[PDB]
Write a protein that binds this DNA or RNA. Structure first.
Lengths: 96, 108, 206
RNA sequence: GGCCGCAAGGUUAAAACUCAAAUGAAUUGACGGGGGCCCGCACAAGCGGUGGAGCAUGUGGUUUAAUUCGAUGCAACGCGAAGAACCUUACCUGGUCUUGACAUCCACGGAAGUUUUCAGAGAUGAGAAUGUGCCUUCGGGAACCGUGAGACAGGUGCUGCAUGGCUGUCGUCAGCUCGUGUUGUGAAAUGUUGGGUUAAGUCCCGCAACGAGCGCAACCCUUAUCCUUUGUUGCCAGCGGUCCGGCCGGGAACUCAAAGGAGACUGCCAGUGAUAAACUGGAGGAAGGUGGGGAUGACGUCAAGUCAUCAUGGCCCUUACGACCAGGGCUACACACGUGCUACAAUGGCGCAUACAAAGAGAAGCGACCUCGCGAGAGCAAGCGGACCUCAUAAAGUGCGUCGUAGUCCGGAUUGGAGUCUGCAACUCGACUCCAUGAAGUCGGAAUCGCUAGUAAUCGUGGAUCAGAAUGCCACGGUGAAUACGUUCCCGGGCCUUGUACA
């Protein structure tokens, strides 16, 4: 899982919306087609380390990146093993 | 219990298609053994050229045998031996009915 | 090698869900999130307490933690040891202001984990498997349990490239779906080698 | 050494030395161009690409400061990766952070936290401000902010040839062994072998066996057709108000939409065959000779898959196969090839008008009515929170000519730049798009791979990986083929019976 990414998990997930849930509303008119200035562009990237397009949607309970799922919040082999332990409600093998 | 009760209706009839095939054949070779409760207290092979496979297993465990052997036999297994006519269907009734007039009184 | 998990095919069949909550889309991943941090944690105290299953439903902002056990006299503690203490966990780290429901299923040598984890408890004891398997097969053959299938994984005795085991017995019709198999693998941490165990138990046709 | 002999030779017949054996029969299996049996888009009839070239991809080869890796006899290679500006990154450095990123563990203060200058590429850092809430029986603290100090946090780091779990394949193949029974001194056979018959150890007659468990079957999802269920957000047979719109009564009706029953069993008859099952025809229906597809992979051989997902016996770098930030590449091609789509035209650049689908997608939303963009796209954004609303009702099909199988009027490239969209972030490495630009290509050699009915195909339609990257991937709609003699050979087998000094 690259176990040191579980350090860098919260470091790249938490402050993304703890900085850009409200500060994006603070500049939501200017670069949009409503009028264009560089003070908002100076406001845009005077830091760098906040990014809401850095979250790769790592898996939940063991953290494997590839094979992640939208609805389940789990990845390739963990969707399987939770469905085999019955941890997921109402989920049989698909057949029709 | 499926037969002596009415509980043979279970296991719907595509299953009950094949289930009669033991019911054809289980009661074939198990005729006089359902009423049995013990080891055969005697032994009676009627002919010693067809079921000498049986006699070879019959002499193996020491039960007396009231056989009827043939003219061309390996006779030295049945130690109570009769070289009667063990062919000719008219004659095979003439020993089995001859014994059976008394064995009701045999138990006394 | 070449199998399916005998629970995973049968949850859509008469074998029921051992956890069944319901929610909707956004919280659909955060609810079984909460259900995992209790299932990794209830093992950590109820290990010697003969743990069987953990059942979770969500009626209304609450979970009915329906613990199934077989040795409940050690589960309760000093008659109040584990009433609110094991509702203290679910309130924040699961986020669920819930209740607790402990309940015993009898026959403490017949459930899947129990037949599994006893042999581990006998291999953590490190008795001979050749004396352990042959009795612990027949504990199921004692109390009913119409069929058993127990494979002990390798690194057993003295070897580094080892073999598998069987004791197939009775009837184990797992390839036919209508057979409600109480299956649960366990793992025994003897020093050299991960000696695992696979336990198939057939609890009657339905 | 005689001895016989013209000799060539024969007979009679040692020892030193050297090895721990040399041998016979025998039941399993091994290999062999022993041999046979039955099936299988196996090959043959049948039908298309591929290899040539427009062209996607990785494996590549060099290129690269790095182009991280796994995989690699078929089963590595547009399915690891179901996705690369950063992150991912496992790769490289510029910047650097060393009790750390983060946790166990205590100390000692600061409540945490909140605004802002400053300087940086951002970390880091000059920091000031700011507050001092809560438990508080005010000693202490919850809990982090902060270092000092330490056990030591950390390593997508090595062999699945150490093993857990998971997994490719033989293989939907029909195979695989055991309890009792006896033949035999036993190793072992008989159970499993004959008659045939089936998709089949499927089944019956003969069985030297009786018996069972694993496996093929059926249990199950599905649709091919009913009744009952009961009218929303969806329908109008019938009846009407109709401002033809179920629009409005009404009717649960046509039909659509989900709960839950039938019926199919070679059943029936005739015939085949031993009178056996199995099967050949008939009837019926929407359905007949496991209705059909899914789903489901026995003992296992395969040092094969993932030690980089966690796990992980054993090894290891610990001011570090680490950590911590800006940033670059994994997209160079100069091209071999593994698999695809567009072409090369008895209809393509065109414009036109009828016709109608299922499958489904949605509040960090779908996004209409609108207004608007030359298109790309800007603003207006109801409604639906979802058979309401949005997404989005569309295709070959027709009514019409165009235009003549010509490298263009087929084709589509190559080189350049307008107008916005996205994302801080794309020039290197984002696509869609107005206009001119008009290549290679006239069906592709040797050959290869693939497929038996809504079938190869040939055109419509969404889903995810998703800030924005679909040719594909995963699923649904329409039109509708060519046909099957066969086991010769080949592949893939296996079973039943032959010979070897090969474990």
């Amino acid at each position: 899982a690259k176990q040191s990414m579980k350090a860098r998990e919260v470091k790249r997930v938490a402050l993304a919306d703890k900085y850009f849930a409200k500060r994006a509303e603070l500049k939501a008119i200017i670069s949009d087609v409503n009028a264009r200035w560089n003070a908002v562009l100076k406001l845009q990237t005077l830091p760098r380390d906040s990014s809401p397009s850095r979250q790769r949607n790592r898996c939940r309970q063991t953290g494997r990146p590839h094979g992640f799922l939208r609805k389940f919040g789990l990845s390739r082999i963990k969707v399987r093993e939770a469905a085999m332990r019955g941890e997921i409600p109402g989920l049989k093998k698909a057949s029709w | 219990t499926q037969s002596q009760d009415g509980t043979f209706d279970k296991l719907t009839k595509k299953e009950a298609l094949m289930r009669t095939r033991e019911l054809e054949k289980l009661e074939n070779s198990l005729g006089g053994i359902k009423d049995m409760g013990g080891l055969p207290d005697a032994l009676f092979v009627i002919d010693a050229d067809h079921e000498h496979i049986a006699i070879k297993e019959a002499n193996n465990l020491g039960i007396p045998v009231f056989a009827i052997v043939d003219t061309n036999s390996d006779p030295d297994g049945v130690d109570f031996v009769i070289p009667g006519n063990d062919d000719a269907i008219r004659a095979v009734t003439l020993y089995l009915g001859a014994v059976a007039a008394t064995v009701r009184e045999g138990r006394s | 090698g070449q199998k399916v998990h005998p629970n995973g095919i049968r949850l859509g069949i008469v074998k029921p869900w051992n956890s069944t909550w319901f929610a909707n889309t956004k919280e659909f991943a955060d609810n079984l999130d909460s259900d995992f941090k209790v299932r990794q944690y209830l093992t950590k105290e109820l290990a010697k307490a003969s743990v069987s299953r953990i059942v979770i439903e969500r009626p209304a902002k609450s979970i009915r933690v329906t613990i199934h056990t077989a040795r409940p006299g050690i589960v309760i503690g000093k008659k109040g040891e584990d009433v609110e203490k094991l509702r203290k966990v679910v309130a924040d780290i699961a986020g669920v202001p819930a209740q607790i429901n402990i309940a015993e299923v009898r026959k403490p040598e017949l459930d899947a984990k129990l037949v599994a984890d006893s042999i581990t408890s006998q291999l953590e004891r490190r008795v001979m498997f050749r004396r352990a398997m042959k009795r612990a097969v027949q504990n199921a053959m004692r109390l009913g349990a119409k069929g058993i299938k127990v494979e002990v994984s390798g690194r057993l005795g003295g070897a580094e490239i080892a073999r598998t085991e069987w004791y197939r017995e009775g009837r184990v019709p797992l390839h036919t779906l209508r057979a409600d198999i109480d299956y649960n693998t366990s793992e025994a941490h003897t020093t050299y080698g991960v000696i695992g165990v696979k336990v198939w138990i057939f609890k009657g046709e339905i």
